Design a protein around this nucleic acid. Structure first.
Lengths: 96, 80, 93, 104, 93, 104, 80, 96
DNA sequence: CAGGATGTATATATCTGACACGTGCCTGGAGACTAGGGAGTAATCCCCTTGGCGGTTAAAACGCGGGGGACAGCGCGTACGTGCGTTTAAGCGGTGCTAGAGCTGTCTACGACCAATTGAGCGGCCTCGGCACCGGGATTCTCCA
DNA sequence: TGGAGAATCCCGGTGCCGAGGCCGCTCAATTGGTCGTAGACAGCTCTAGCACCGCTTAAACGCACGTACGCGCTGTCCCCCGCGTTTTAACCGCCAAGGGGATTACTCCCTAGTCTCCAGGCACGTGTCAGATATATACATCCTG
């Protein structure tokens, strides 16, 4: 069978997903997670659909930026594979 | 509601990384990303719930989320 | 209730700058919220500036200095130029 | 009765902006020239952003501005990026940027 | 001109918590400016909260919500408890 | 004429804080309980910071609080450091911290 | 006034690095530090001069510098 | 003659300077540099002494924080010597 | 271990300039009190948020070879720390000088504001047209060879 | 290069629901007086910022040297990517309840506004004292040894 070299599909996916504006996390799991988190602060809360949509948009944008910084940190260490130490360093420099 | 943090699956993290320009991903990246996502969502939802409670409402509106995000310097357009 | 927005004026500016290009309602809302955000930023900057000098009034000078504080570089320079031109046109007639 | 915007030669609503300045309680008095200057600055910023978005749409070869084009215009310009560094635009996507070391 | 400052009250609080510990004038200035900064932050948060709900009044509820928005975690919880205690003492007596 | 501060059991100047709330024109009206609540919050924060600063001064074997001790108190507690993350204290110095890999 | 950026000598940058926990320093660190210091000072001084010009003054006050630093999220105590 | 091993005096200086609160840049060169920079914005300006002192304090604090982040970036790359690439990475992550 | 310097602490006088304390007075607080406006509250309704459900598909799970990247070890040469005179420029105290922040009258432009008035703008419907999508063709990359 | 093998693009219909327009109608912008007000505008005054100068010393600085760290290389192995195959759970359409949040009166109460006291807080005069500061004096401390 035909097999692409490792990494080729990785850049193909990189080029594809940077071109689209769709949401990458499934809506129902994120909605459930948001409700579970909000349950700890105030019980019996209701969410407008636009509120959950805004939360998902902000979370995805934040994670994309965090992964950009993580890739920068991993490249700095002469590596291509991102690692938890890269995320930790990126968050530490950001002040989080 | 319990264990919905596992609802952020490995393909979702991989797609988020691909959108960010990442080429290879380690195994523990998924757990680290779930932790940081939980932290971010906890902060934002705490601020949004505070805004909702102040207005004597029980329904979290989109404007509360917009204000909560703005308070952290992450102003979000398209939901005004 | 009447929700007041800058959609008409944003459309007018677009048709003045791009005669044949339209705009979607999503971009309309994004532009409206951007205008509201910039308005809020400039207004709060001017209010803080007035409080610092204990002046009870907001004049065009406060707006100009808020523009210089908030907008960066050549954007701020051009904004100051257009503001001064418009104020001169207004008080000249 | 000529409108103040027409008198100052501005498209933006000088009168509405004056009302917004009074209603916000920013100061106890509001000068006559403040709404005109603020309207001019807002018109300039809107014209700049719309120009860049229309150019980006033209390079995309579309005849309508969409939030993707606005995001591209924001992230292409330097001073607009500095002004809008921390903002997130709905359905804006990201700037296509692949680092050199990742290339084969 | 008489410049108002929190030096006496800061000294009183210090003598209430640390009877035998002194303080330099630089530390007084730093503490006073810290109190001024926190006051300013809470005041602007309360004003924004009032503007969001179209309420022209700043009540103790606005201050409480500003405290929860600005101070973090257990510090915010303790501040809310002391504020509620002081308001109750003022009202009931 | 009993003062409001002593009436609410607060050392901080409820009257002065009420005057400051009126002067800033944050809103048209201020409640009777807003100055008391704000004074209580300010007194609590001052008491906490002074407590940690005095403890830091005692660990340094000095009687007198100095800005160095205030900086130590701010950076020792997680809550205040979270509140004062972006703040630089005059003559505060830095936390003594040497990375493990730098040691011989 | 000309070439006063060279007034930030190598020992000063080395001491600043030592205070920050740095053990070894490369050669080009001094030039990079001078550049970044010039950028930071340019930003802060621009904001301070704007504040001074608004008040119709010709002397840059310490309060102007405090406001300029605050506008960048670098609140500085001890000069209020 | 007696010579300490490299890094011993470096660690001694690290311990010494983290304990003191003195200013590390000479006052006159920094004052001259600030005046030269301010000359580009508005000519014939006068500076209050406290203004220059505040500028120096802020600049030294900012540089100390930047060097802390630079040291973190250098440790991330399995190095002890800090390099211009470390400063560039730290500034890029900070958003400067 | 271990001896020999080596800064680094470790006491010890000592004096000094940096702060707790009087002081007086006037400019904030406290009290009184009133009218109007805001806010709480009570109803009220409809619309939006939730909950269920069923079908069914495409994404998530689940092994699994395989290749490519991390990564430890390894020479090596160079650039950074470290002594070491040397010089130079910052510090520092004092002195003249001047220019401009701060404060004080003063009055005239200049803005709030409201009652008519009216014009433009906003919500609720028509309508058609750029565009998304979707097969097939064309093109282009990309691994293998 | 070159051929397979898959990926990307791209065009043509084809559907389509979302912009653009439009229309009552309401509110808000314009006008028109009118009168507190406030801010610029001189005038002044003192003070702090500047300018300078002698002189000294300690920090910069150039340089020689020794060392240890960057860094490329060199295998090497393991574990992340690509790729099928299940399988399952997200999704989507829809509908029924239900509840809750704006909203509208509506009354009352509470805060400004002001004025009359009254009081405490706030920049200089005291005085004094803990803390810097040289100065010996141990105390670790670290490179040799």
């Amino acid at each position: 069978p035909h097999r692409f070299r490792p990494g080729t599909v990785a850049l193909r996916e990189i080029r594809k997903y940077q071109k689209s504006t769709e949401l990458l996390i499934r809506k129902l799991p994120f909605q459930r997670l948001v409700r579970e988190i909000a349950q700890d602060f105030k019980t019996d809360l209701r969410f407008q659909s636009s509120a959950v949509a805004a939360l998902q948009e902000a979370a995805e944008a934040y994670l994309v930026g965090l992964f950009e910084d993580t890739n920068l940190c991993a490249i700095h260490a002469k590596r291509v594979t991102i690692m938890p130490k890269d995320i930790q360093l990126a968050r530490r420099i950001r002040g989080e | 509601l319990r264990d919905n943090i596992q609802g952020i699956t490995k393909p979702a993290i991989r797609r988020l990384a691909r959108r960010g320009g990442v080429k290879r991903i380690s195994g523990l990246i998924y757990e680290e990303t779930r932790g940081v996502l939980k932290i971010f969502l906890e902060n934002v939802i705490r601020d949004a719930v505070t805004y909702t409670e102040h207005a004597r409402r029980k329904t979290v509106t989109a404007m509360d989320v917009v204000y909560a995000l703005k308070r952290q310097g992450r102003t979000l357009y398209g939901f005004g | 209730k009447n929700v007041e927005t800058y959609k008409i004026y944003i459309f007018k500016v677009l048709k003045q700058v791009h005669p044949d290009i339209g705009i979607s309602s999503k971009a309309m809302g994004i532009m409206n919220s951007f205008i509201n955000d910039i308005f809020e930023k400039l207004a709060q900057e001017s209010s803080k500036l007035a409080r610092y000098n204990k002046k009870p009034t907001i004049t065009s000078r406060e707006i100009q200095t808020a523009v210089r504080l908030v907008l960066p570089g050549e954007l701020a320079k051009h904004a100051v130029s257009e503001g001064t031109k418009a104020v001169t046109k207004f008080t000249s007639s | 009765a000529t409108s103040r915007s027409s008198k100052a030669g501005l498209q933006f609503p000088v009168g509405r902006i004056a009302r917004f300045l009074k209603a916000g309680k920013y100061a106890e008095r509001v000068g006559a020239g403040a709404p005109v200057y603020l309207a001019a600055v807002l018109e300039y910023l809107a014209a700049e952003v719309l120009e860049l978005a229309g150019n980006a749409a033209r390079d995309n070869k579309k005849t309508r501005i969409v939030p993707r084009h606005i995001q591209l215009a924001v992230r292409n310009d330097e001073e607009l990026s500095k002004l809008l560094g921390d903002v997130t635009i709905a359905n804006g996507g990201v700037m296509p940027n692949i680092h050199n070391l990742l290339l084969p």
